[PDB]
Structure 1
Amino acid sequence: MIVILDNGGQYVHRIHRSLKYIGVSSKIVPNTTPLEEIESNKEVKGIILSGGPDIEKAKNCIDIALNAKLPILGICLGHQLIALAYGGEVGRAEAEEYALTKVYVDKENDLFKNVPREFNAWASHKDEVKKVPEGFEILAHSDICQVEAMKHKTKPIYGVQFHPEVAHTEYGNEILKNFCKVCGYKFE
């Protein structure tokens, strides 16, 4: 089962629904849930940090990003919080409204197994990762965002700027599936 930290975003239930479509159970929990409670439950195989409105109102995620041993995926805010936790930089950007964005995969790693090199994703770009942390690498970019996706070079920590959990994101469920494969799930 995947635990989803609810960072207050409108697509939190869409993460649960999308994971269900690929046969993976998940549980939405408060974003204040302590790390020890998440990792002592032997049913938990990975952690998703959801989108949400307020990078100041999702600090417990920094502790999680730094100290969890389970794989972690951050989505929009989640991705930004991972960047901040490891000493990268985040800031405001221009294209704030949700829109279909053509994403270019620079490193298949994973997130992008069995995903084409180019695909359209549903994304806002009100905020973005300005400086990838040390020890991370960029996986994907768009015309207007240098960091559409990233991961730690060796740890199973992944970030995406866009929302794979909604239908407008092409191959979104396959991106989710790849993260669940890192979590130990198997898929025909």
Structure 2
Amino acid sequence: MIVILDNGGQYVHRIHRSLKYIGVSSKIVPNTTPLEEIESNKEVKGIILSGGPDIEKAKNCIDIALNAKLPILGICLGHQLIALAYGGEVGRAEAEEYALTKVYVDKLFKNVPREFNAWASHKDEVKKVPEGFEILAHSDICQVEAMKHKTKPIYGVQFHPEVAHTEYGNEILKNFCKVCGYKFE
């Protein structure tokens, strides 16, 4: 089971519907869900922090990003929240509207080409990557399209892998799920 923190965005049900596509069970919980509740359910093998319009209403994800023992994928707001949580920096970015963005893989991306089109907003972006993290990908307009913690199973993506408009979206979700112990036969 994967747990999805609902940070309020339009694409949270889509996360559940894409994980289903690749045969991964998931459930949406409100983003005020204490970390203890999530980890007491031993079926939960990973966490997704969803997209969301307001970082100041998703403060509890910072607690989850720092303290969880399970793997974490942050998506857009969630990517920014992981960055903030380890003492990285977030700021206004280049363009608010969801658009197709060419992403360059600089190093999650098993079975994915070096360039691919991703569905992304750039209202906000990680300005400073925290200690213990490294950039996995970038676009022309965004230095940090994806990142991961070097030793902890924690991943962020500025773009929405759950949206069909993202090429290899389900492959990216599936690579995350493999880290969460999921077998794909």
Tell me how far 1:95 sits from its aligned partner: 1.2
Tell me how far 1:93 sits from its aligned partner: 1.3
User: What per-residue deviation string (whole Å, max 9, x for no partner) do you get for residues 138-163 of structure 1?
Assistant: 00000000000000001000000000
Normalized per residue, which structure has more strand? 2
> What SS does the aligned partner of 2:3 have?
strand
User: What per-residue deviation string (whole Å, max 9, x for no partner) do you get for residues 96-127 of structure 1?
Assistant: 100000000001xxx00011111000000010
How many residues of Structure 1 are paired with residues of Structure 2 in the alignment?
185
User: What per-residue deviation string (whole Å, max 9, x for no partner) do you get for residues 8-52 of structure 1?
Assistant: 000000000000000000000000111011001011000000000
TM-score, with normalisation over the residues of structure 1?
A: 0.98
Q: Distance in 2 between matches of 1:120 and 1:90?
A: 23
Cα pair 2:94 2:142 within 8 Å, conserved: no
> What SS does the aligned partner of 1:113 have?
coil
Q: Distance in 2 between matches of 1:160 and 1:97?
A: 17
Question: Identity of paired residues, percent?
Answer: 100
Which structure 2 residue ranges, 5 or more long, are not aligned?
A: none
* RMSD value, Cα: 0.4
> What SS does the aligned partner of 2:143 have?
coil
Q: Distance in 1 between matches of 2:41 and 2:13?
A: 22
TM-score, with normalisation over the residues of structure 2?
A: 0.99
User: What per-residue deviation string (whole Å, max 9, x for no partner) do you get for residues 64-104 of structure 1?
Assistant: 00000000000000000000000000000121100000000
Q: Distance in 2 between matches of 1:97 and 1:21?
A: 26
Q: Structure 1 runs of 4+ off > 4 angstroms?
A: none
> What SS does the aligned partner of 1:154 have?
coil
